[PDB]
Design a protein around this ligand. Structure first.
Ligand SMILES: Nc1ncnc2c1ncn2[C@@H]1O[C@H](CSCC[C@H](N)C(=O)O)[C@@H](O)[C@H]1O
Ligand SMILES: Nc1ncnc2c1ncn2[C@@H]1O[C@H](CSCC[C@H](N)C(=O)O)[C@@H](O)[C@H]1O
Lengths: 230, 375, 375, 231
RNA sequence: CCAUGAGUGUU
RNA sequence: CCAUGAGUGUU
RNA sequence: GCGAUGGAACACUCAUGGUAGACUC
RNA sequence: GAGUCUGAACACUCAUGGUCUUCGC
């Protein structure tokens, strides 16, 4: 049962205390009474919140592992590569609210079938069934964004991220890049992969800000925050 | 000279420095704009683009979609392609405002409301098109058919244990699951077995002799009719499953001849569809090199070896190809590499709708396998 | 003081030093000797032994099978039991010659010919007696029921993927597999869905209108009647399998109420039969301690924690007990220990045919569960 | 693959077959010509049929390959076989001891004896006993004393069961072949420790240790000890 | 096979 | 789950 | 040996990526 | 980037063992 919900240090990201001692991250629900993936809806002082499972959402994991600054805030415009079935982008939609925008790119039709259910209720989310290797296939729909958030299982994921930044990320914007080591090279040690991919980024004029290991929320995953210098 | 911008907004003509030269706004029709986005993906210019350039009469057009260059050149324009140009970023950084100026939308809310219905409609259409691909039907069918085979074997193993309580000698005498389930379905109590009733089911006289001899000597227990009837439910289910298995196999034959006749000519419809299932689609199968096709289905062995450094697999699911699994171990690598080579060709011909050469691929392979068996 | 030897060849009375005092030779009858061997392992003396001891009138009798001591005492003799006595070793080292001396057999070859047929007939009768145990039937039935459950789930998962090509929104609208299979079986093309046909099948108005609305707006593909018929083959199999499952579960109720009523009173026929299946038999289940019963079915976690020192499992297949799996994790250990303790008692009542106390064991257990939850 | 020759080995009635692939495989002379037991290959050579003896499925063949110096199972031998299972190894014991030898096969799982029964029906050599090895008072009424006690039972106290059957049935100065199944005795322990503990128990019961053979790789976590019974 | 996302059955 | 024995299916 | 306490039940489906070693051009 | 050569395909059923910690009597 809910003791209290108060705002954390990051805009529109909240923390809920429960009487059994638990603490859980949550966001204010853009679509009250509707859950996305079976998460708990929390009511406190009129307002409804959605608990944000960090074992299913890399952004929530990154926050619980010490993400210092979060470029995703109210009114942010986000290009989301790898939108999948909607779990993390639904919370992104909560945080950014109606005046922010989340363009969601995902190339698997089987999973966009579910993402469309999330997008239908959130005028915030623009689903694009498209291949992130080919930003020419959705430049006709999107605009330039403050944040590029990339979580695609591809061996050249970092190059794909960089390519989309040249199209769409404002200069001095930010990139949150998930590095999925077993999807880049399953034979290599993830620690090496992280070093290698960040090297790419800094070679492409991305000022590294922070690198976060996602264990235990995700095995063999890191997430990188960089500022795109142009 | 002029930078062509094509967007949901319409077509917009820009200078070297980012100043709108001219524009034509798209109609606010969801159907029309999605159709033009779909078209524009295979390079067809927006009809608004065609009216724009006819008005602007440009000296050189920089576009952002490479497939569009021949399309516009065929209209009589000088065309170059440029990815993530400075000008198209300047355009994208001035949305949503530029949609109000060129009067596609009355205000920001109006613009984003339309864009949102647009993305939904665009996505629904790309989902419908993906669902129309007929290779999906072969894939589901052969996955279902493999579930059925596994189930037939699971239930037949159970029935043999369960019915052996009453008639244990039958197990070793009847190797064929379908015949074993037939005996249990038809008779139940081993006391009901007779020459004529077994003959009537199609057994030959020597087999019928061995069976009636075992039933008479049987060390098995006496059970009730209700006990026998619980067993016959499994046997009848097995019989029904073989009938579905054969229907599915006939269904799969017609779909695979339609979807991938050249692959089917080489490996048959079931094994052909398993290659599709593991690849994910015919288009995916036709991108793979022979050496990947060769080990489709062997992902556990391959990655075990890729880690430990152990011995890699010589074949994936193509081990089901008779000349592979019925040949000696030392010949199998070479045969699998010959089959993978023809599969890769067959898949490309099927994915690009080339002329049927599958029977000739088969002859080339049969003769190449003949070369190898001299070992 | 006499050492009684009881063997296939008959009953021999030996003095303390290995000398034959007297003997009675069994008849050369496979059926008779086999029956007397079976009675004897239960302590029942040979009919030849009875005849022999009356002849010898011993002062004391040493027997080889301890179960026989009370039976010979009830005949008026002083009797003791000696394991692997020297005299019985002297008897056995004098075979096969002693079998010729007491005229049970003409020669060695005759003796071993008969001994071989005896061992086969002895082994055959024990195999028959083992197969006659009623708990074997419960164990097979619940195993086939678990295959059926696994299969129903596997086919239903495949059907949803397959039919979703044509009607993808139905998957999230109908969560029960039997209803999903029912809709596919009855209608096929989502076009054929009407209000009253769906009413026929028992759906309610609110659900029916969601289904019809989704079918109108569906972005699923259009496919042939023959494509739908292949799907409906899996649907109808699913529905046949649910009917088999229910008939089997009703069969299992009958057997378990007869084979282990006390166990059935605590956990139901299906969970009780799973315990029998993992333990191997009611007799084995009744030898186990509560702590072992508690984790039957969790051997993977158990031995992982033994070999790594990790955390052991709190429950095995009894996790299926509703009061365990619907309870908060911090109570399950206590709850599972309380259930396991009642199951150990119940298994022993059933195995040795004590008086039925299952109703009372269940009352005790549910009171203990109330105590636990009110911490 | 084609048979070059089959020659007798050091041990009586155990033969070694030679193939042109340069491989060798143990075999025995088939007591029942033209029948197989577990799918093994029937090998004809100079007018006599042999049965290939797969050391991966038979502890006794494996022990020979791993250096067993002497073999108490010869022709005419009388053997008590505890753990006869479905008949793989005992069928070869039957070939080696021939018609004048006797092999008493004790096995307590009815499911598997169903199969053993078929092997025995064709071999007068073999007397199948569906019986618990912990209960030698059962089969004492059928068997006789024996020159060899062969024990291969998965039981935590398999060694005590072997010793207890020996006091009933094994002649003084007869031999015990005891397979030590480390994982069926205690999975938590090192097999090498299990072997010393079990051999120590045998030597404490007046069994003289003749040879201890580790059976890897034909069987993992397995040893086999040949001991002489002193009485 | 590994990592990741989404789910089902015994319930 | 580990070791051991016997087998099955795609064939 | 008994008790109390502690404490990782199993069976599966889909989607994305990760695809070897030598030698020859 | 081609080629040749080397080279551990999958899915399962049954049977026998191996059943923790702590604290108390
Ligand atoms: N080239 C590509 N273009 C678009 N999506 C891609 C892609 N390659 C991989 N993906 C998608 O990347 C996804 C990784 S799963 C990511 C989970 C998601 N970010 C969440 O919020 O929960 C998969 O859905 C996969 O289909
Ligand atoms: N107490 C006991 N009495 C009789 N057999 C037993 C037993 N305990 C275990 N066994 C049997 O010992 C066997 C171990 S497998 C042995 C295989 C066989 N010796 C061969 O090489 O071919 C199993 O069949 C098991 O049922």
């Amino acid at each position: 049962e809910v003791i209290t919900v108060k705002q954390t240090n990051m805009e529109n990201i909240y923390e809920c205390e429960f009487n059994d001692g638990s603490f859980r991250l949550c966001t204010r629900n853009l679509v009250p009474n509707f859950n996305v993936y079976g998460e708990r809806l929390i009511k406190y002082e009129g307002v409804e919140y959605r608990e944000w499972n960090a074992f299913r959402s890399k952004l929530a994991g990154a926050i619980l592992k010490g993400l210092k600054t979060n470029p995703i805030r109210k009114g942010t415009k986000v290009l989301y590569l790898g939108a999948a079935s909607g779990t993390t982008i639904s919370h992104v939609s909560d945080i950014i609210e109606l005046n922010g925008k989340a363009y969601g790119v995902e190339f698997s039709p089987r999973v966009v079938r579910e993402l469309l259910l999330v997008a239908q209720r959130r005028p915030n989310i623009f689903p694009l069934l498209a291949d992130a290797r080919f930003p020419q296939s959705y430049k006709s729909v999107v605009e330039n964004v403050d944040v590029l958030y990339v979580d695609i299982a591809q061996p050249d994921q970092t190059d794909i991220a960089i390519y989309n930044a040249k199209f769409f990320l404002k200069v001095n914007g930010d990139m949150l890049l998930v590095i999925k080591a077993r999807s880049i090279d399953v034979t290599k040690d993830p620690k090496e992969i992280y070093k290698t991919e960040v090297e790419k980024l800094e070679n492409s004029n991305f000022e590294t800000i922070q690198i976060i290991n996602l264990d235990p929320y995700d095995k063999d995953h890191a997430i990188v925050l960089s500022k795109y210098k142009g | 000279k002029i930078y062509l911008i094509e967007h949901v907004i319409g077509a917009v003509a820009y200078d070297e420095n980012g100043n709108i030269v001219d524009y034509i706004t798209n109609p606010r029709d969801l159907g029309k704009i999605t159709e033009e986005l779909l078209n524009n993906e295979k390079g067809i210019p927006f009809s608004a683009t065609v009216e724009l350039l006819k008005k602007v009469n440009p000296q050189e057009v920089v576009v952002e979609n490479e497939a569009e260059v021949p399309k516009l050149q065929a209209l009589g324009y000088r065309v170059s392609y440029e990815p993530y140009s400075k000008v198209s970023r300047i355009f994208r950084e001035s949305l949503p405002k530029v949609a109000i100026d060129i009067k596609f939308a009355s205000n920001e809310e109006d613009y984003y409301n339309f864009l949102h219905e647009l993305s939904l409609e665009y996505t629904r259409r790309k989902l419908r098109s993906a669902a129309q691909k007929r290779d999906l039907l072969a894939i589901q069918a052969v996955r279902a058919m493999d579930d059925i085979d596994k189930t037939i074997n699971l239930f037949s193993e159970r029935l043999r244990e369960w019915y052996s309580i009453h008639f244990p000698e039958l197990d070793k005498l009847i190797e064929d699951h379908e015949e074993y389930a037939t005996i249990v379905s038809r008779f139940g109590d081993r006391g009901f077995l007779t020459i004529d009733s077994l003959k009537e089911l199609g057994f030959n006289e020597q087999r019928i002799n061995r069976i009636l001899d075992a039933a008479k000597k049987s060390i098995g227990a006496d059970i009730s009719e209700d006990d026998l009837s619980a067993m016959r439910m499994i046997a009848n289910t097995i019989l029904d499953l073989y009938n579905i298995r054969r229907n599915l196999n006939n269904y799969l034959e017609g779909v695979m001849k339609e979807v991938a006749p050249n692959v089917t000519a080489l490996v048959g419809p079931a094994l052909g569809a398993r290659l599709l299932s593991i690849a994910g689609s015919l288009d995916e199968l036709a991108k793979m090199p022979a050496s990947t096709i060769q080990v489709l289905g062997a992902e556990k062995a391959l990655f075990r070896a890729l880690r430990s450094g152990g011995r890699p697999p010589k074949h994936g699911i193509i081990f089901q190809y008779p000349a592979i699994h019925t040949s000696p171990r030392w010949q199998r690598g070479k045969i699998a590499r010959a089959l993978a080579a023809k599969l890769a060709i067959a898949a490309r011909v099927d994915a690009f709708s080339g002329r049927f050469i599958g029977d000739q691929l088969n002859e080339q392979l049969k003769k190449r396998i003949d070369e190898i068996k001299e070992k």
